[PDB]
């Protein structure tokens, strides 16, 4: 799996990309969506590699961002979408414990956000940190740059929104 | 090989067998017992030997239903040279009455015939004897006037198979005559060329071969 957050905005480029930011979802900055690593995937993210952060979050680092920014088809109450507002205690959308268990199945593979407990992407992240890498997107991770992968590189970024 | 910069054309090519740009020629007219990948009433020439084949192509195959090749003649018939036209009228005539109608000849197969009202019965064919056919391709060879290639065609024509060809691009007769000029129909073989080499000093016998042909048109074994 991967987590995608679009650090760079789409000032105007590129057009083929930006198309494939949307379609992921995430039509904004600092938004975040979970993608399964598969073909018909991996192609798109690679295309949008310079735009966004990327990588496996650790789970229990994905639980953190589910609870804070979570779901609901329609943004509304039960805003926290905690375990209670996840798998149906009673009748309702369900799946598992409605917590880390949720971001357990997700991390391995399916189910997807909307598929179970049909509340969909995207994550709406705050974007803070002391700062993100060096300001301005650059070549990549091995340089001042938020670019690319690392399990516990997207952990910090994912953390502190 | 070479640097492989070049590509070589061969298939049948390389060493010659078939031609191309011919043998494609033949084929379009779907002929053979049935639809053919390549069909003919092949005529080959060998020193001291003439061969007639006949058959539609296969993916791998190029089968032949019935063959001639004076050599077998005389099965019945007689011992003489086989490298002459007479005795290359006989075959290609003997093949006819083998390929020509025995195993099967022109497009005749079990089941409904190819689209078109066509029925074939024993005896003269109804609705025209016209449907019998094969195209005869000399292989690599040279078209000449009365040439054995053509001659092979002449018998193995009046053998029932009907092949296109052009008259006046044959030996006439004489070299290979008809017994009687008023009736085209007859089995006819002549070897006049050699005959009259001497007058009838001795040796050659044209008379013997008419003998052969007599046997050919008739109820004979294989």
């Amino acid at each position: 799996l991967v987590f995608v957050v679009r650090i760079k905005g789409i000032n105007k480029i590129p057009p083929k990309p930006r198309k494939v930011l949307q379609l992921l979802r995430l039509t904004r900055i600092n938004s975040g969506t979970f993608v399964k690593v598969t073909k018909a995937t991996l192609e798109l993210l690679k295309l949008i590699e310079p735009y966004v952060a990327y990588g496996y979050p650790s789970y229990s680092t994905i639980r953190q961002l589910v609870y804070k920014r979570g779901f609901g088809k329609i943004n509304k109450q039960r805003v926290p979408l905690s375990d209670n507002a996840i798998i149906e205690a009673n009748l309702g959308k369900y799946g598992i414990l409605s917590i880390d268990d949720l971001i357990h199945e997700i991390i391995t593979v399916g189910p997807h956000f909307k598929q179970a407990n049909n509340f969909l992407w995207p994550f709406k992240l705050s974007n803070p940190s002391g700062g993100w890498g060096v300001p301005r997107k650059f070549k990549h991770f091995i340089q001042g740059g938020s670019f690319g992968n690392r399990e516990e590189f997207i952990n910090k970024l994912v953390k502190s929104m | 090989a070479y640097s492989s910069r070049f590509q070589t054309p061969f298939r049948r090519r390389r060493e010659g067998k078939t031609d191309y740009y011919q043998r494609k020629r033949l084929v379009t007219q779907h002929k053979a017992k049935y639809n053919t990948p390549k069909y003919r009433l092949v005529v080959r020439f060998t020193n001291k030997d003439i061969i007639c084949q006949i058959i539609s192509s296969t993916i791998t195959g190029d089968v032949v239903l019935a063959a001639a090749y004076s050599h077998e003649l005389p099965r019945y018939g007689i011992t003489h040279g086989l490298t002459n036209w007479a005795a290359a009228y006989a075959t290609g005539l003997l093949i006819a009455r083998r390929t020509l109608q025995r195993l099967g000849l022109d497009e005749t197969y079990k089941g409904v015939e190819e689209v078109e009202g066509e029925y074939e019965l024993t005896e003269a064919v109804e609705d025209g004897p016209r449907p019998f056919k094969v195209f005869l391709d000399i292989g690599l060879q040279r078209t000449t006037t009365g040439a054995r290639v053509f001659g092979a065609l002449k018998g193995a024509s009046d053998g029932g198979l009907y092949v296109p060809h052009s008259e006046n691009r044959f030996p006439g007769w004489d070299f290979e005559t008809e017994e009687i000029d008023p009736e085209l129909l007859r089995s006819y073989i002549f070897g006049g060329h050699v005959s009259q080499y001497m007058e009838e000093l001795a040796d050659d016998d044209e008379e013997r071969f008419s003998e052969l042909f007599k046997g050919y048109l008739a109820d004979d074994i294989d």
């Binding site: - | 910069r5 070049f6 590509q7 054309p9 191309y20 740009y21 494609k24 084929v27 379009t28």
Partner: protein
């Protein structure tokens, strides 16, 4: 100048190994009704040739007119209509992936 043999240069041309006449089999092969066929122009052909623009795209064969098969790119031209005019021979290749 302007004409069918416009700037083509390579697209039309077939070189060294495959030069001369081509096999009959391709142009004899029959396709029937909606069959997706690619279009191209094999060089060494002098008939049953489409234009030059539009060569390379697939179209769906439809009925045959004269000795030539309606096919051509039945398919769309650019992002557009399947406005199709097809007059291609079997000589140009058929088949689908």
């Amino acid at each position: 100048s302007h004409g069918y043999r416009s700037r083509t240069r390579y697209m039309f041309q077939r070189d060294f190994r495959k030069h001369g006449a081509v096999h009959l089999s391709t142009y004899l092969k029959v396709y029937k009704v909606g069959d997706i066929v690619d279009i191209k122009a094999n060089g060494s052909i002098q008939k049953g040739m489409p234009h030059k623009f539009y060569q390379g795209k697939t179209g769906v064969v439809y009925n045959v007119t004269k000795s030539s098969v309606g096919v051509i790119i039945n398919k769309m031209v650019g992002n557009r209509y399947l406005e199709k005019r097809l007059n291609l021979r079997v000589e140009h290749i058929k088949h689908s992936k």
